[PDB]
Chains A and B, each alone.
Chain A
Amino acid sequence: SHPLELSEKNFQLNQDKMNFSTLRNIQGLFAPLKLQMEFKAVQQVQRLPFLSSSNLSLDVLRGNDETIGFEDILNDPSQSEVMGEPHLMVEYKLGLL
Chain B
Amino acid sequence: MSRGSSAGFDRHITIFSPEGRLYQVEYAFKAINQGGLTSVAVRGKDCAVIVTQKKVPDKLLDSSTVTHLFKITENIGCVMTGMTADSRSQVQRARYEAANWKYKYGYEIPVDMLCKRIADISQVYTQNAEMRPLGCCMILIGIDEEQGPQVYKCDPAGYYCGFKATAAGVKQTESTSFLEKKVKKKFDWTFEQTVETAITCLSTVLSIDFKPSEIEVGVVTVENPKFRILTEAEIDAHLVALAER
Residues of A within 8 A of B (CB): 23, 27, 31, 34, 37-38, 41-42, 44-45, 57, 60-61, 63, 65, 67
The reply to whether the CB of B177 lies closer than 8 angstroms to some CB of chain A is no
B192 an interface residue at 8 Å Cβ cutoff? no
Report B70-124 residues with CB < 8 Å from chain A CB.
89, 92-93, 95-97, 100, 104, 117, 120-121, 123-124
Residues of B with C-beta under 8 A to A45 = 128
CB atoms of B89 and A60 under 8 A apart: no
Complex Cα–Cα for A35 and B130 (A): 13
User: Do residues A27 and B131 form an inter-chain contact, with CB atoms below 8 A?
Assistant: no
A45 CA / B100 CA spacing, docked (Å):
25
Does B100 contact A63, Cβ atoms closer than 8 Å? yes
Shortest distance in angstroms between A34's beta carbon and chain B's nearest beta carbon?
7
Contact B124 A60 (CB under 8 A): yes
Total interface residues on B, CB under 8 Å, equals 20
Chain B interface (Cβ < 8 Å from any Cβ of A): 1, 89, 92-93, 95-97, 100, 104, 117, 120-121, 123-125, 127-131
- When C-beta atoms are compared, the residue in chain A nearest to B121 turns out to be A61
CB within 8 A of B120: which of A37, A60, A67? Answer: A60
Which one of B121, B124, B127 has the highest number of Cβ atoms from chain A below 10 Å of its Cβ?
Answer: B124
Report the nearest B residue to A59, measured CB to CB: B124
Chain A nearest Cβ from B102, distance in angstroms: 12
Q: Which residues of A contact B127 (CB under 8 A)?
A: 57
A61 and B119 CA atoms in complex are apart in Å by 11
